Amino acid sequence: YSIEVRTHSALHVVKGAVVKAAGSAAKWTTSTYVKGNKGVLIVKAALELDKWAWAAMEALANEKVKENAPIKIYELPREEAEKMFGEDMYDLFPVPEDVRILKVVVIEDWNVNACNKEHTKTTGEIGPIKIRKVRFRKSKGLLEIHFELLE
Ligand SMILES: [Zn+2]
Protein backbone atom coordinates (compact mmCIF):
# COMPACT_ATOMS: atom_id res chain seq x y z
CA TYR A 1 0.00 0.00 0.00
CA SER A 2 0.61 3.62 -0.67
CA ILE A 3 1.69 5.52 2.42
CA GLU A 4 -1.08 8.00 1.70
CA VAL A 5 -3.61 5.19 1.29
CA ARG A 6 -2.58 3.97 4.74
CA THR A 7 -2.49 7.45 6.26
CA HIS A 8 -5.95 8.04 4.86
CA SER A 9 -7.31 4.81 6.30
CA ALA A 10 -5.77 5.88 9.60
CA LEU A 11 -7.99 8.97 9.56
CA HIS A 12 -10.99 6.67 9.94
CA VAL A 13 -9.36 4.77 12.78
CA VAL A 14 -8.21 7.94 14.54
CA LYS A 15 -11.65 9.53 14.17
CA GLY A 16 -13.23 6.52 15.84
CA ALA A 17 -10.66 6.77 18.64
CA VAL A 18 -11.44 10.44 19.23
CA VAL A 19 -15.17 9.75 19.54
CA LYS A 20 -14.57 6.83 21.91
CA ALA A 21 -12.21 8.90 24.07
CA ALA A 22 -14.43 12.00 24.07
CA GLY A 23 -17.91 10.63 23.28
CA SER A 24 -20.36 12.25 20.73
CA ALA A 25 -19.40 15.81 21.58
CA ALA A 26 -16.42 15.62 19.31
CA LYS A 27 -17.91 13.55 16.54
CA TRP A 28 -18.29 16.02 13.69
CA THR A 29 -15.29 16.39 11.40
CA THR A 30 -14.78 19.83 9.91
CA SER A 31 -11.78 18.92 7.76
CA THR A 32 -8.88 16.56 7.26
CA TYR A 33 -5.79 16.16 5.17
CA VAL A 34 -3.13 13.63 4.46
CA LYS A 35 0.39 14.48 3.34
CA GLY A 36 2.74 11.55 3.03
CA ASN A 37 2.85 9.72 6.35
CA LYS A 38 1.05 12.50 8.21
CA GLY A 39 -2.57 13.34 8.74
CA VAL A 40 -4.66 15.94 10.50
CA LEU A 41 -8.19 15.50 11.75
CA ILE A 42 -10.15 18.50 12.93
CA VAL A 43 -13.46 18.08 14.71
CA LYS A 44 -16.04 20.21 16.45
CA ALA A 45 -15.54 19.85 20.19
CA ALA A 46 -18.20 21.05 22.64
CA LEU A 47 -15.94 20.52 25.61
CA GLU A 48 -12.26 20.77 26.47
CA LEU A 49 -11.18 17.25 27.37
CA ASP A 50 -9.14 16.02 30.31
CA LYS A 51 -5.38 15.40 30.55
CA TRP A 52 -5.78 11.70 29.71
CA ALA A 53 -7.54 12.18 26.36
CA TRP A 54 -4.47 12.57 24.11
CA ALA A 55 -2.93 9.33 25.38
CA ALA A 56 -6.32 7.61 25.42
CA MET A 57 -6.83 8.48 21.75
CA GLU A 58 -3.45 7.10 20.74
CA ALA A 59 -3.98 3.90 22.73
CA LEU A 60 -7.45 3.35 21.28
CA ALA A 61 -6.24 4.01 17.73
CA ASN A 62 -3.42 1.48 17.99
CA GLU A 63 -5.65 -1.08 19.68
CA LYS A 64 -8.00 -0.92 16.71
CA VAL A 65 -4.96 -1.37 14.48
CA LYS A 66 -3.76 -4.65 16.07
CA GLU A 67 -7.33 -5.85 16.07
CA ASN A 68 -6.80 -5.86 12.32
CA ALA A 69 -10.48 -5.16 11.83
CA PRO A 70 -11.91 -5.16 8.31
CA ILE A 71 -12.52 -1.77 6.72
CA LYS A 72 -15.88 -2.41 5.09
CA ILE A 73 -17.33 -0.62 2.10
CA TYR A 74 -20.97 -0.16 1.20
CA GLU A 75 -21.70 1.47 -2.14
CA LEU A 76 -25.40 2.29 -1.75
CA PRO A 77 -28.12 4.61 -3.08
CA ARG A 78 -28.00 7.81 -1.06
CA GLU A 79 -31.46 7.40 0.53
CA GLU A 80 -30.68 3.84 1.65
CA ALA A 81 -27.32 4.97 3.01
CA GLU A 82 -28.93 7.76 5.01
CA LYS A 83 -31.49 5.36 6.47
CA MET A 84 -28.84 2.82 7.35
CA PHE A 85 -26.22 5.23 8.71
CA GLY A 86 -27.89 8.58 9.28
CA GLU A 87 -26.15 11.96 9.19
CA ASP A 88 -23.25 10.31 11.05
CA MET A 89 -21.56 9.28 7.81
CA TYR A 90 -21.15 12.86 6.60
CA ASP A 91 -18.45 15.36 7.45
CA LEU A 92 -19.21 19.04 7.62
CA PHE A 93 -18.95 19.72 3.87
CA PRO A 94 -21.79 19.53 1.41
CA VAL A 95 -22.22 16.48 -0.83
CA PRO A 96 -23.72 17.69 -4.10
CA GLU A 97 -27.36 16.75 -4.45
CA ASP A 98 -26.61 15.07 -7.79
CA VAL A 99 -24.53 12.40 -6.07
CA ARG A 100 -27.23 9.73 -5.76
CA ILE A 101 -24.84 6.89 -4.88
CA LEU A 102 -22.38 6.89 -1.99
CA LYS A 103 -19.41 4.79 -1.05
CA VAL A 104 -19.38 4.57 2.69
CA VAL A 105 -16.59 3.31 4.88
CA VAL A 106 -17.46 1.34 7.96
CA ILE A 107 -15.24 0.14 10.77
CA GLU A 108 -17.82 -1.70 12.86
CA ASP A 109 -18.77 0.17 16.04
CA TRP A 110 -15.96 2.62 15.46
CA ASN A 111 -16.50 4.84 12.45
CA VAL A 112 -18.86 5.41 9.52
CA ASN A 113 -17.96 7.84 6.78
CA ALA A 114 -19.06 8.59 3.24
CA CYS A 115 -15.73 8.55 1.40
CA ASN A 116 -14.69 7.75 -2.18
CA LYS A 117 -10.96 7.22 -1.58
CA GLU A 118 -8.89 4.03 -1.57
CA HIS A 119 -8.41 2.28 1.76
CA THR A 120 -6.50 -0.63 3.21
CA LYS A 121 -8.59 -3.79 3.47
CA THR A 122 -8.03 -4.05 7.23
CA THR A 123 -6.81 -1.78 10.06
CA GLY A 124 -3.68 -3.83 10.67
CA GLU A 125 -2.18 -2.63 7.39
CA ILE A 126 -2.03 0.90 8.81
CA GLY A 127 0.74 0.12 11.27
CA PRO A 128 1.61 2.02 14.48
CA ILE A 129 -0.17 5.35 14.80
CA LYS A 130 1.52 8.17 16.58
CA ILE A 131 -0.29 11.28 17.73
CA ARG A 132 2.33 13.98 18.15
CA LYS A 133 -0.15 16.79 18.64
CA VAL A 134 -3.59 17.57 19.92
CA ARG A 135 -4.64 21.21 19.96
CA PHE A 136 -7.90 22.39 21.44
CA ARG A 137 -8.87 25.85 20.32
CA LYS A 138 -11.31 26.93 23.00
CA SER A 139 -13.03 29.94 21.36
CA LYS A 140 -13.63 28.18 18.03
CA GLY A 141 -14.65 24.95 19.69
CA LEU A 142 -12.27 23.01 17.47
CA LEU A 143 -10.04 20.03 18.18
CA GLU A 144 -7.06 19.12 16.02
CA ILE A 145 -5.51 15.66 16.07
CA HIS A 146 -2.14 15.46 14.33
CA PHE A 147 -0.80 11.97 13.76
CA GLU A 148 1.73 10.07 11.70
CA LEU A 149 2.46 6.62 10.36
CA LEU A 150 5.63 4.67 9.68
CA GLU A 151 6.80 4.53 6.06
ZN1 LIG B 1 -12.04 7.43 3.65
What ranges do the domains of the chain cover? 1-71+119-151, 72-118
CB atoms under 10 Å from CB of 48, counted, come to 11
115 is in an annotated binding site: yes
Task: Write out the DSSP string of 25-88.
Answer: GG-EEEEEEEETTEEEEEEE-SSPPPTTHHHHHHHHHHHHHHHT-B-EEEEEEHHHHHHHHGGG
Q: Resolution of this entry in Å?
A: 1.8
d(CA 14, CA 144): 11
Query: What is the CA(80)–ligand 1 centre distance, in A?
Result: 19
Query: What is the CA(124)–ligand 1 centre distance, in A?
Result: 16
8 is in an annotated binding site: yes
Its CATH class, for the domain covering 72-118, is alpha beta
User: 1-71+119-151 with 72-118: one CATH topology?
Assistant: no
Query: What is the CA(2)–ligand 1 centre distance, in A?
Result: 14
Query: Solved by what technique?
Result: X-ray
d(CA 6, CA 118): 9
HSE (CB half, 13 Å, CA atoms) of 18?
A: 31
Query: What is the CA(11)–ligand 1 centre distance, in A?
Result: 7
Q: Which of 12, 14, 107, 102 is nearest to 53 (CA)?
A: 14
Query: What is the CA(91)–ligand 1 centre distance, in A?
Result: 11
Q: What are phi and psi of 92, to 5 degrees?
A: -80, 50
Query: What is the CA(56)–ligand 1 centre distance, in A?
Result: 23
Under CATH, which number does the domain 1-71+119-151 receive?
3.30.980.10
